[PDB]
Amino acid sequence: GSHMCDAFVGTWKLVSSENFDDYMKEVGVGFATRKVAGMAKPNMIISVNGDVITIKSESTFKNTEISFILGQEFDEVTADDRKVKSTITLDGGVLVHVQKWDGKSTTIKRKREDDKLVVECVMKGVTSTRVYERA
């Protein structure tokens, strides 16, 4: 077993969002995509198999998936179609995902707080908080 498995593995459903439209604007998402993606109610599925972690985001807007090893950079196509260089690490008990593209950077952190899984997305002073609970 592991901290990672105990904290994060399973199926999570979105329960609240704040500032997500503004975060998407900062990242460069266009109007129509922001409206439909903002209306989404995703499930987040996190699994571990050996050293490989998989995170899936599933909704009526889009289904996406990433698999990775902690600390090892990979190329990712995001839901809004950015081509980014991604690295995910465990910093204390927080899963930290950094995306780099076009001289820009954004960070997505996932942390447990009580029964919830809190997702914080930060771009240049703009933070969005998305709260998930177990499905």
Ligand X SMILES: O=C(O)/C=C\C(=O)Nc1ccc(Br)cc1Cl
Is 131 within any annotated ligand binding site? Answer: yes
> Could you tell which of ligand X, Cl ion, none binds residue 111, using a CB distance below 5 to 8 A set by kind?
Cl ion
**Element spanning 98, H or E:** strand 94-101
> Could you tell which of Cl ion, ligand X, none binds residue 123, using a CB distance below 5 to 8 A set by kind?
none
Backbone phi and psi for residue 21, each to the nearest 5 degrees, phi listed first: -55, -50
> Per rule CB under 6 A, is residue 33 in the interface with ligand X?
yes
3 vs 48: CA distance, rounded Å: 11
> Per rule CB under 6 A, is residue 84 in the interface with ligand X?
no
> Per rule CB under 6 A, is residue 46 in the interface with ligand X?
no
Classify residue 25 as left (phi > 0), alpha (psi -120 to 50) or beta: alpha
> Per rule CB under 5 A, is residue 116 in the interface with Cl ion?
no
For residue 78, which of 129, 124, 23 has the smallest C-alpha distance?
A: 23
- Interface ranges with ligand X (CB under 6 A): 24, 27, 29, 33, 37, 42, 57, 79-80, 108, 119, 121, 130
